[PDB]
Amino acid sequence: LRTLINELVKGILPRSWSHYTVPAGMTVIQWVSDFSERIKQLQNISLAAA
């Protein structure tokens, strides 16, 4: 938690959070929006499949 809070305060994307490949130098504030859009698309895909 200390490491994660440090990363969030400095605005760096946490290493644990970064699981899909991203362009270099990508901050966490835009990473959150990108991940939100990806999750929305994943929910649409899963709802269509189910």
């Binding site: 969030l8 959150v32 939100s36 999750i39 929305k40 929910q43």
Partner: peptide
Amino acid sequence: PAWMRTLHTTASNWLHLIPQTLSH
């Protein structure tokens, strides 16, 4: 601390923005 409160607000906003469901 100001950093503590601003991080609380930022994380709460992120929780609001981030979707909360994804079924396998």
